[PDB]
Amino acid sequence: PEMVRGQVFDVGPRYTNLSYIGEGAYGMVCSAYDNVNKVRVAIKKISPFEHQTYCQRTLREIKILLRFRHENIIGINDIIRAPTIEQMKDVYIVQDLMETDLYKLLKTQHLSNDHICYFLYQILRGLKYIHSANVLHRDLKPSNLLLNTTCDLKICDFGLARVADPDHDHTGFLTEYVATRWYRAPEIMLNSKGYTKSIDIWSVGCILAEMLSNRPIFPGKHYLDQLNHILGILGSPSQEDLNCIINLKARNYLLSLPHKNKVPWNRLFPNADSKALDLLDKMLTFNPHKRIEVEQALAHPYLEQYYDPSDEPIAEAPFKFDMELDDLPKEKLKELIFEETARFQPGY
Numbered sequence: 001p002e003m004v005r006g007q008v009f010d011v012g013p014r015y016t017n018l019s020y021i022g023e024g025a026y027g028m029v030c031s032a033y034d035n036v037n038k039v040r041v042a043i044k045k046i047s048p049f050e051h052q053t054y055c056q057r058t059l060r061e062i063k064i065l066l067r068f069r070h071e072n073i074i075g076i077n078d079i080i081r082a083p084t085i086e087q088m089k090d091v092y093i094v095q096d097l098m099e100t101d102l103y104k105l106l107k108t109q110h111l112s113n114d115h116i117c118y119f120l121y122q123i124l125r126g127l128k129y130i131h132s133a134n135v136l137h138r139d140l141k142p143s144n145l146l147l148n149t150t151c152d153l154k155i156c157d158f159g160l161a162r163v164a165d166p167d168h169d170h171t172g173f174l175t176e177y178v179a180t181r182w183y184r185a186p187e188i189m190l191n192s193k194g195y196t197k198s199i200d201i202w203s204v205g206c207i208l209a210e211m212l213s214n215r216p217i218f219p220g221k222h223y224l225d226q227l228n229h230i231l232g233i234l235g236s237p238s239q240e241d242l243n244c245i246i247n248l249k250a251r252n253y254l255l256s257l258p259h260k261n262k263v264p265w266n267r268l269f270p271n272a273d274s275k276a277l278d279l280l281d282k283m284l285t286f287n288p289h290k291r292i293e294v295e296q297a298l299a300h301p302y303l304e305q306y307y308d309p310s311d312e313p314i315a316e317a318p319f320k321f322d323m324e325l326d327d328l329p330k331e332k333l334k335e336l337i338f339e340e341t342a343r344f345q346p347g348y
């Protein structure tokens with residue numbers, strides 16, 4: 001099997017000429033050539049089976065991405081794994097090949113307002129579809145916004161996604177422990193229940209702020225410091241803001257902090273388009289019930305030159321998992337992953 005940086009990529013003979021792209025906390029990603037379809041692809045290797053939470057990520061990403069079909073969402077082309085469950089230790093997810101991601105892009109170039117506007121449009125267009133399927137992405141960040149040579153944008157990295165169900169979701173706090181928290185809505189860090197589509201709009205607002213200055217807006221060093229970063233710009237929450245915090249402990253914590261004044265957006269972004277700052281303001285609102293929704297964001301004057309509901313597709317029906325996975329042991333999740341990937345095996 002071909003080796004990349006001392007790592008086995010057992011994807012031949014169909015896929016060859018592997019080249020390292022990058023990696024996340026869980027997957028190593030290579031470009032490759034598909035000799036069957038005569039096209040370039042990306043391949044993500046993950047090795048999840050010793051960790052329940054990693055198994056959850058892998059099963060969610062596979063199930064959701066195979067059901068979604070949208071220009072601004074990465075598709076799964078193929079999945080490689082061993083022919084028996086006992087031999088299966090790695091999973092290779094084959095996707096269309098993108099050229100870079102927005103994290104990498106922002107480290108080497110400043111974006112013009114036209115570029116920012118177009119990228120934000122594509123993010124919200126993809127998000128409109130995700131939310132129309134009643135799915136929460138829950139982990140949007142610059143590194144999982146992929147870009148290609150023609151400057152098309154696709155959202156990837158769905159291992160934290162969940163069906164939106166604030167009234168009946170007793171999953172609790174996020175069980176993701178490695179990746180960044182700079183884009184997490186304040187209610188994600190304060191409450192263990194009741195997450196809505198507004199958590200993704202918060203993330204997009206953080207991404208917009210970062211496109212405007214090439215610096216993350218809330219780069220907290222740890223849990224309480226993240227909160228202080230948010231409050232140091234939005235100012236102390238109002239009385240109505242405080243009611244969204246269901247955990248009276250967390251709310252009394254916030255009440256105990258020293259008062260902080262709001263920082264006007266045009267002090268942070270003095271040269272930015274005022275329409276961009278107006279939309280940003282509506283995306284980064286502490287109260288999730290007051291935060292702008294994805295269709296309202298698309299219809300905002302900042303995006304006027306792109307907004308077109310005739311060309312912004314939605315899902316036919318809301319996505320459903322057919323089972324709750326949070327309490328299944330990893331050995332059961334391994335069976336479900338084996339079953340979910342059998343459709344890519346000969347003789348299914």
Ligand SMILES: Nc1ncnc2c1ncn2[C@@H]1O[C@H](COP(=O)(O)OP(=O)(O)NP(=O)(O)O)[C@@H](O)[C@H]1O
Nearest residue numbers: 022023024025026027029042095097098101143157
């Ligand atoms: N289809 C793709 N084409 C090109 N680059 C890709 C593609 N998928 C992923 N990448 C790159 O690989 C990186 C890791 O992918 P990702 O799916 O986020 O991995 P992960 O380890 O499963 N989760 P995370 O820790 O959140 O990044 C991305 O941030 C991109 O730079």
Ligand SMILES: *[C@H]1[C@H](C(=O)OCc2ccccc2)C(=O)CC[C@@]1(C)C(=O)OC
Nearest residue numbers: 099100105115118147148149150151152
């Ligand atoms: C698109 C362009 C882009 O998306 O680049 C893709 C890429 C960057 C780096 C390495 C490999 C691929 C930009 O980043 C600038 C804005 C776009 C719209 C452009 O090029 O317009 C002229």
